[PDB]
Write a protein that binds this DNA or RNA. Structure first.
Ligand SMILES: [Cl-]
Ligand SMILES: [Cl-]
Ligand SMILES: [Cl-]
Ligand SMILES: [Cl-]
Ligand SMILES: [Mn+2]
Ligand SMILES: [Mn+2]
Ligand SMILES: [Mn+2]
Lengths: 94, 108, 98, 83, 91, 104, 78, 96
DNA sequence: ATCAATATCCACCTGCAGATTCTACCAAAAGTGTATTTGGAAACTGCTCCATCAAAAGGCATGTTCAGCTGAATTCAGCTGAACATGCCTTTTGATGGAGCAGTTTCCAAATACACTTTTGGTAGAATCTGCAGGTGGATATTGAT
DNA sequence: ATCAATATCCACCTGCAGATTCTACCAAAAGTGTATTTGGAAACTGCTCCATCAAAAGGCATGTTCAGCTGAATTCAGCTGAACATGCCTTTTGATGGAGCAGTTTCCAAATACACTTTTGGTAGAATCTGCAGGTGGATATTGAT
């Protein structure tokens, strides 16, 4: 009766991009949903503290970036920072 | 009167910028959220999801399956040094463990 | 004349076999009774979503398997191949569990 | 009927299987009781918090999310049970 | 800006009227008070959220104390907290 | 006429309330929340100061220093558990030599 | 400069840790372990420094860095 | 000429340093080490003195705690001497 | 197990350095009083799922026997690490000079908030599609040998 | 370096339970307009830290000697693994009753808002107070010799 939201259709779209003829089981989709929620909270929680430490009332893409650098290992952080920067510059041109 | 285009399509993303924004605002993270914040965040969640699905998809093709199951996810993460670090305190339900027998235990 | 594997041979096959699979290794109904007994001691007349018991079982087994891995390292370190309570205890102590 | 002594239902063969997954080749006879006590402490700790979340929500039913939050609190994030 | 020093000091004079405290030690108590404040407030924040509530009440503080503090510390804490709220509400 | 005085507390209720409102924890804060919280903080503080005071008089000093806080916490099973991941600067460690290392 | 962490200082740390006898290989091993530790903590502390657009690492930056890593340090606040 | 037996001075030292709380690493060499590591992240960094001191407090407590675990690993192997393999077991079980 | 000779520890003592307290001012918190709004507790109620039961099949726990090989104990040597003496040098600590940071304030353009209205992407079931769970048999590898 | 006995590998086959695709309703993004906030370019100022220098004071580096710890070798008792039979109880799957999630509504106790007034904690010199940096001698432990 009630609407239950989740990241499933987005995980699925990214799945078709990387492996067009590969599917995913429902348990495996539940694992990906947990993964997306977990990283969301980690980054958002770090960004919150960063703003609070710096007496800022606003979380901007800059806090997100620093959170990513604090949370992700090595080359993952680099590629994440690249994708995030690209998406923001692209969006702003729109 | 303008025709709607989603923030995700503007950002060139698959993940939902609008939802991520709402979730940032409803989560008590800060009093205000900049316009670029949910875009950058969505792009990062999308990138990480891609990385994991890439490797797990490879693990499924290796044991001859067309469908990713938790085992392939676990193989993907634990055989990748950065994913393993990131998810070092995470339990994957129905993941099992990497095959690994200490050498001293094998017969002579 | 009747065939007999040497001690250790069958254990190694079991290691390979269970490290290959992902199924729960504790019988489900006895685990459920255990979870109910313990929860009941915190508050009576509790019910469980079926998936809440299964979450407890995934988490428990993952914990125990991870601990046996660490226990196995402590036993090998002492130049044994047999795990003993002192190995579990060393593992939990260094983990900060005890 | 009264639930009693259900830790004893975690059998020696199940404990052996778990150790096998953990890479263990030989097992002292004292390990089985030791493991039962360690599992009991673990489950007590997780279930105590999950029920606390259940009570705070004023429910009589423990949910998977109560268990997920309890596990998270204790530095053991579990994936696959959110929805 | 601020610290808990004068409050820590007042409480020291309550349990040990003739004992003092060094500056470095007062600094450790300040970190202690800040650390626990944050642990409880954060847990209370998460509790309200999980339950789709926009308000942290004394009930969230209590449950957070029960989740965070061990055994007997939890019991006395919950007592001190309920006692203060009851004394406050009648006053 | 302070909220702290109404509640019978030494710890600052008005301040705890401000800190709760400003820390992004929820949109609203109940009137009882900062009273309950201040009382828990005061109580935990008294517990440690009681034990650290005892620890100081036992090594014959009149003034608590970080060493005494560490002795207090590490010798107490519930505080040790609460503060198990905490480093007390200038605290040192509990004197403790494994039995197998001693002579005879 | 890691070498400036001397065998005597490392011996003292082990003594506080209750250690009676010490292998000669321990000293190099310890230097690498400390190095990894300090890299990780200083990397994050500096990240907080930069985010604030400061050029000076503060005690609070180090405290935040240690916290991020599950180590809480008391006495330097804040 | 007078000579203590092996182990007697070592026990004397354990008792001395478990009683005391002073930093055990020399301050300047440590300050030098922290500055070097930091430069590979950003070259113009300054440090508050209390910030170098937080790093030293944190580093020493970390190493002392690690030596405790290391010592337990050595003892477990019926040794009284800590070896790199003990350090490694300890860090491995800790998740480092 | 004593004894004497040695080396280090550790109570005890006490002036004074520097911690603590006193003296005093004052923004900014905290409190008050009053006016309004509103989150959420109560009281329902429908509809999921949870508890419980049961049979039947057979999977798997349990119990027993027995011997391989492991842990425990003992003995012994070589070689490493502890204890020193020796003397050369790195660190402490105590100042100085001065620049180059942070931390404040003001003040508008640029950014974000948020209510209302349109529009459509996301969800729930329904309808289809189809990997692969299971249930085979055979090929191939491994084991332990008389 | 064969053989017999076992277990494991590893395709094959195919209906159906589970995954995917489709459809339609509608909740929530999106577009718009306008009210608030905010972060920042400027323009200051006073702490801080960095750089440098030098006098000694401990503290480290070094080499030698040898106590004794580690590791290898060896031996043996008994524990734990492997293999069986037996039969208990888990697993399946299927049905049923109903507790109690959730979804909805109504409406106050309890929250936020805001103007105005007092109180107080932070702050910094000055004034006093008293723990401890050191400096012992005696107390305590340790050692080699009997
Ligand atoms: Cl932004
Ligand atoms: Cl044992
Ligand atoms: Cl309240
Ligand atoms: Cl080694
Ligand atoms: Mn019971
Ligand atoms: Mn309402
Ligand atoms: Mn005052």
């Amino acid at each position: 009766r009630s609407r239950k939201e989740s990241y499933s259709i987005y995980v699925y779209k990214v799945l078709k991009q990387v492996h067009p003829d590969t599917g995913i089981s429902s348990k495996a989709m539940g694992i990906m949903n947990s993964f997306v929620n977990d990283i969301f909270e980690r980054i958002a929680g770090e960004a919150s503290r960063l703003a609070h430490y710096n007496k800022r009332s606003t979380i901007t893409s800059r806090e997100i970036q620093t959170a990513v650098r604090l949370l992700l290992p090595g080359e993952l952080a680099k590629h994440a920072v690249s994708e995030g920067t690209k998406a923001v510059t692209k969006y702003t041109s729109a | 009167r303008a025709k709607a285009k989603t923030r995700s399509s503007r950002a060139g993303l698959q993940f939902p910028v609008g939802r991520v924004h709402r979730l940032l605002r409803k989560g008590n993270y800060s009093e205000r959220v900049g316009a670029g914040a949910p875009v950058y965040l969505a792009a990062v969640l999308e990138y990480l999801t891609a990385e994991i699905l890439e490797l797990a998809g490879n693990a499924a093709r290796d044991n001859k399956k067309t469908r990713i199951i938790p085992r392939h996810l676990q193989l993907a993460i634990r055989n990748d040094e950065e994913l393993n670090k990131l998810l070092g305190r995470v339990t994957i339900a129905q993941g099992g463990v990497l095959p690994n027998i200490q050498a001293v235990l094998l017969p002579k | 004349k009747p065939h007999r594997y040497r001690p250790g041979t069958v254990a190694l096959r079991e290691i390979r076999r269970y490290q290959k699979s992902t199924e729960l290794l504790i019988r489900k109904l006895p685990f459920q009774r255990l979870v109910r007994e313990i929860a009941q001691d915190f508050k009576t007349d509790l019910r469980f979503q079926s998936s809440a018991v299964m979450a407890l079982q995934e988490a428990s087994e993952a914990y125990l398997v991870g601990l046996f891995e660490d226990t196995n390292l402590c036993a090998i370190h002492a130049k044994r191949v047999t795990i003993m309570p002192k190995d579990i205890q060393l593992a939990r102590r260094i983990r900060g569990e005890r | 009927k009264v639930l009693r002594d259900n830790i004893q239902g975690i059998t020696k063969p199940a404990i052996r299987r778990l150790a096998r997954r953990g890479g263990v080749k030989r097992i002292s006879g004292l390990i089985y009781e030791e493991t039962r006590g360690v599992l009991k402490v673990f489950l007590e700790n997780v279930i105590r918090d999950a029920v606390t979340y259940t009570e705070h929500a004023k429910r009589k039913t423990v949910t998977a999310m109560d268990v997920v939050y309890a596990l998270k609190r204790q530095g053991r994030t579990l994936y696959g049970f959110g929805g």
